[PDB]
Design a binder for this molecule. Structure first.
Ligand SMILES: NC(=O)c1ccc[n+]([C@@H]2O[C@H](COP(=O)([O-])OP(=O)(O)OC[C@H]3O[C@@H](n4cnc5c(N)ncnc54)[C@H](OP(=O)(O)O)[C@@H]3O)[C@@H](O)[C@H]2O)c1
Ligand SMILES: NC(=O)c1ccc[n+]([C@@H]2O[C@H](COP(=O)([O-])OP(=O)(O)OC[C@H]3O[C@@H](n4cnc5c(N)ncnc54)[C@H](OP(=O)(O)O)[C@@H]3O)[C@@H](O)[C@H]2O)c1
Ligand SMILES: NC(=O)c1ccc[n+]([C@@H]2O[C@H](COP(=O)([O-])OP(=O)(O)OC[C@H]3O[C@@H](n4cnc5c(N)ncnc54)[C@H](OP(=O)(O)O)[C@@H]3O)[C@@H](O)[C@H]2O)c1
Ligand SMILES: NC(=O)c1ccc[n+]([C@@H]2O[C@H](COP(=O)([O-])OP(=O)(O)OC[C@H]3O[C@@H](n4cnc5c(N)ncnc54)[C@H](OP(=O)(O)O)[C@@H]3O)[C@@H](O)[C@H]2O)c1
Ligand SMILES: *C(=O)c1cccc(-c2[nH]c3nc(N)nc(N)c3c2C#N)c1
Ligand SMILES: *C(=O)c1cccc(-c2[nH]c3nc(N)nc(N)c3c2C#N)c1
Ligand SMILES: *C(=O)c1cccc(-c2[nH]c3nc(N)nc(N)c3c2C#N)c1
Ligand SMILES: *C(=O)c1cccc(-c2[nH]c3nc(N)nc(N)c3c2C#N)c1
Lengths: 251, 251, 248, 251
């Protein structure tokens, strides 16, 4: 039987590319999404057309709240319901926007979104994933190669991504006796924000030492595929930068 | 005029020793507390005996919630109302307990407490601190030297402390133009929990290369004193381990 | 045309596994050795049995000296001579023994810092100077911040190797040369080490309470040289079964 | 009796500031120097004029060679000979210049100077200091806050500074049982090279978030003074950045 993977925030961009590659490697996939319903169902069709009964969608808001644990349990439950198993969790979904320290969402909303999506939901998902467990079980967290050289005024985002590092490490340690690996992949600049002006994009591109270009979504996914594969069986608690040297560049 | 400091969770143990030494150095202090009113009041009385009108207490729950921002703004305001100013914020209060990933606080409460005290309250206190602003303004976050070799099954605690490194860095960068420096002190093993058997304390003590003992609260306070002093005026984004070499010791 | 790879210290143990896998992936390989001539040649014989003229051996002391630069230049020339090209350099060779703070100490400097950092720097200079999917992989150490007691110089060499990884990644990026690392925790334990001291280390490893095989270290190396890692440079991948996460 | 300190490369710039400050704190100091004999005795004269018999010079090349161990052993011997003890060792001397990987001195000589001054000499001096020994013994290594975002084409220097981090850690661990603490101080930009053009100094200055200026040599020396002081007696294996936030600024 074919193994199954959950990918959060998988309707578009990097998450989609991870879902597509996992699928091409032989996985059945839960394509989680929040707002991008059309793109998610569209991807599940593309996939199932290629191999029938291999992709389902699963809608969930991953903002922090008192129901997030239930929501996360349900994303995992959904994989077992469609496919009878859950081998791989990829925590990819993430909110990303500035939260300046000094002065239209309230600040409690900003905490819930940025820390929910980037850290707490991954914790809750990781918890449900393990509670529900030949086998090659692993988790891959989408981290950030620039965590120690952060975007200006992005303190909540950055705090989320730092937490995700801590979770990668704590979970690898605690879950290792159960044969579940936990690793990360840390893009530098990859697919840039849709809302970002083209001048800002180029300004980021020209900083990258390897090819003066952002990573493709496919390049991020390749690292993911490696970490879940048989060639990474002794790897746990590792975070692989996939940043073309960007974090190596001084101010 | 004497500068003023806020110390969170200042009733006991490390934060008390921090508030004491700060006061000894000529700071006026807001002693924040959650449940330990009697120790907090007793500390304020001892301090006011040394110098009249130099200590006040301030009670608040720092658990994450919709009211946390106002609570943190109110703690900063309390310093200004007492002393006319606020030069130093020390984020010391912290919840600490296991949150195993597998197998009666609900998990959303644990999240709120662990991530609220260790990370989100610090962020909101930082916001309110900066919003309200010779002078030497700084923030010191109480971090954790073992954050990359975490305690088994303390994943939410650990996630909190990592998020705290993130804030320390992100805030140093963003607040440096206001002349606010932001740093950390990272104990390894300091004062062990009150109930802990001495035999269990000895397992940790024995691990410490420098003296086979835990740091006193006073030794942790010394590093805070240094970070706030005129001797550290170019230091921001720095986290000083005060750990006796514990973090260098392999398994 | 098949790409070619230099592997230093490739007669035995992890270097041999890296060479074999590179060969199984389709590389032609230079098997560098210092004392292990017999083992180096039997590897090459075995590899050339699978495919003729795809494995050569290359001898050199990698101890720091006045002659090390030439020696390192020659290891690279030996790949160009055998195969017309050099696509991959694996810095694996390494001296490893204690140097307590309280052989002459100057010889320990020369071996431990020469093998672990200086020779890698010189091999990197020569690789780049003679210059598709080009990369260098350095064998680092996952325990480099929780070092073994009384192993200063080794630890200094492995920290230096981290710095070279980073500096060379940054500086060779414009030539399309990627520079990465693989950091074993505990893999094949030293031959001398007592079986009881071996079991103490095995017990510490969270993922399976066993060391990494050489093949597991090599898989990471294979990934790093592959078209699947074309945006990765200045990365060091730990392959340590979580050992580095385990507090004292 | 007053304690004694050895400061390598102490004739000028940061080394001088450390020796001066250590002197004002009440230390007797060995002023090690290499080529700067005039500045070195001139400093020793000044300091001896404040307190007679409290400063001596000591000439040594710290380039790696087969006699380097003897040279480093004799530096320590020179402190015991002048003062009857050696409490503090500051490893400040450093060669600093580019060594491009792709194309003056031979490369053997570049290795010996850059790795010698920055790593090997400090290791040997550490062996010698330890071998000679309520007091307060410590070593302070002058590191580099930018080691993970290094200067382009400075690989050997950068390798030297990484090695010095490894020494700081390995030595703190191995020497702790002897009550010898080993720490570091890591400038980002402090005094710029004398040969640097002012236009180019300002480029680096503008990168610093905290004041858009370089650290004064006194500001570096302050962190050294803290680490050797009784306020740091539980600190070992710690490297304190003094970089004004420079290391946190992305490309
Ligand atoms: N792009 C980069 O350069 C870069 C750099 C460093 C790290 N990363 C990391 O790499 C990963 C992928 O990056 P990306 O740019 O592809 O991500 P992205 O497009 O910004 O976000 C991916 C998805 O996250 C989901 N999401 C946002 N808020 C959510 C919420 N409250 N609940 C549930 N899902 C939510 C969205 O789903 P819907 O569209 O379905 O609403 C979105 O499509 C992220 O974790 C990111 O932090 C990316
Ligand atoms: N002790 C160590 O070995 C060690 C090691 C690494 C890091 N640290 C860090 O150093 C700092 C001080 O350590 P410690 O051992 O002295 O801390 P602690 O005694 O465990 O806790 C300090 C105070 O935190 C306050 N607190 C807990 N939950 C709270 C909440 N929901 N709202 C508001 N306040 C709350 C409590 O105040 P009340 O008593 O008023 O309720 C408590 O007295 C902490 O940040 C800790 O993480 C300590
Ligand atoms: N095994 C582990 O647990 C572990 C852990 C962390 C890192 N690593 C790293 O992974 C790599 C391989 O590990 P290993 O255990 O396979 O290495 P190893 O067996 O200790 O040494 C590998 C080879 O290095 C060569 N070498 C030693 N001194 C030399 C010199 N002066 N000049 C030239 N070559 C020399 C030797 O070649 P000859 O036999 O031909 O003389 C030896 O066979 C090393 O870089 C090591 O530091 C290993
Ligand atoms: N300046 C900065 O921005 C900065 C940045 C990062 C780290 N640091 C660290 O802070 C420390 C002091 O910096 P600095 O700029 O003041 O240093 P510096 O002026 O470059 O050098 C200090 C002294 O090092 C000695 N030295 C050089 N080569 C030597 C050799 N072969 N043998 C013996 N001694 C030798 C020289 O002594 P003589 O003059 O007597 O020949 C020199 O005056 C250094 O370790 C440096 O790497 C500085
Ligand atoms: C700043 O710290 C930073 C630098 C480069 C790239 C990022 C980044 N993180 C992201 N997360 C999410 N969810 N989505 C996007 N688009 C990004 C980006 C970008 N660009 C942050
Ligand atoms: C495990 O990660 C760990 C090791 C050593 C010391 C600690 C530690 N963190 C704490 N935070 C708080 N708020 N209170 C206490 N007592 C502690 C301790 C301890 N001991 C954690
Ligand atoms: C101590 O720092 C340390 C812990 C685990 C494993 C190693 C290690 N480094 C090595 N280098 C070389 N060249 N050869 C071997 N065998 C090893 C080992 C081991 N085991 C060091
Ligand atoms: C590059 O890696 C880098 C950035 C900032 C400052 C330095 C630096 N290192 C030095 N070492 C020595 N011995 N002397 C000086 N002047 C410097 C400087 C500077 N500036 C390197």
């Amino acid at each position: 039987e074919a193994p199954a993977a959950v990918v959060t925030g998988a309707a578009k961009r990097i998450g989609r590319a991870i879902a597509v590659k996992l699928h091409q490697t032989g996985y059945r996939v839960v394509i989680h999404y929040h707002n991008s319903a059309e793109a998610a169902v569209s991807l599940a069709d593309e996939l199932n057309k290629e191999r029938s009964n291999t992709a389902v969608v699963c809608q969930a808001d991953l903002t922090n709240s008192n129901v997030l644990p239930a929501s996360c349990e349900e994303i995992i439950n959904s994989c077992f319901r469609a496919f009878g198993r859950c081998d791989v969790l990829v925590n990819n979904a993430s909110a990303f926007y500035p939260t300046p320290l000094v002065q239209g969402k309230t600040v409690e909303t900003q905490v819930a979104e940025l820390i929910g999506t980037n850290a707490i939901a991954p914790f809750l998902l990781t918890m449900s994933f393990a509670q529900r467990q030949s086998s090659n079980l692993s988790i891959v967290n989408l981290c950030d190669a620039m965590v120690d050289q952060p975007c200006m005024a992005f303190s909540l985002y950055n705090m989320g991504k730092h937490a995700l590092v801590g979770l990668t490490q704590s979970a690898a340690l605690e879950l290792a006796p159960y044969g579940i690996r936990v690793n990360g992949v840390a893009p530098g600049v990859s697919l840039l924000p849709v809302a970002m002006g083209e001048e800002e994009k180029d300004k980021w591109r020209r900083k990258v030492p390897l090819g003066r270009r952002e990573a493709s979504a496919e390049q991020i996914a390749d690292a993911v595929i490696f970490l879940v594969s048989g060639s990474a069986q002794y790897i746990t608690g590792s975070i692989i930068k996939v940043d073309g040297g960007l974090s190596l560049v001084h101010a």
